Amino acid sequence: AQGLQPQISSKKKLMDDNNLSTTIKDLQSKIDEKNKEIDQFQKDYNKYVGLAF
Amino acid sequence: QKTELQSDIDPKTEKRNKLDADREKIIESQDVIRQNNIADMFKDFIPSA
């Protein structure tokens, strides 16, 4: 039988080793990256429609 | 193998950081064309003054 005490300590070690403090910073990098494109494409659509008239 | 790939992080963190300025140089040159509006253009089509 696998021990119940290390089976808790196995999961408790897994809960400390997690990328969750990293991937959230990684995903907020990409959202702030993709917001810069969206904030740029609004400038494009407000320019081409200006050109199209 | 751990040292193999962090030595590949360093080009990709630099190559991304190279293109950050080369993006924004286009943005600065797009701001010149941005600078006149829809109706600034329409103001120009009337030969007023």
Can you list the alpha helix ranges (DSSP code H) found in chain B?
2-34, 38-45
Cα distance between residue A6 and residue A46, in whole Å: 62
* Contacts by residues A10-15 (CB-CB < 8 Å, ≥ 24 positions apart): none
A-chain CB neighbours of B42 within 8 Å are 53
The CA distances from residue B31 to A25, B26, B27, B28, B37, in Å, are 30, 9, 6, 5, 11
Q: Report the run of H or E that residue A37 belongs to, with start and end.
A: helix A20-52
Shortest CA distance to A29 belongs to which of B29, B21, B20?
Answer: B20
Count of CB atoms situated within 10 Å of the CB of A33: 11
Resolution in A: 4.0
* Residue type at position B8: D
The answer to whether A50 contacts B38, with C-beta atoms less than 8 Å apart, is yes
Using CA atoms, how far apart are residues B36 and B39, in angstroms rounded to an integer?
8
Window 7-46 of B, Cβ < 8 Å to A: 27, 30, 33-34, 37-38, 41-42
Q: Is the dihedral of CA A38, A43, A45, A48 positive or negative?
A: negative
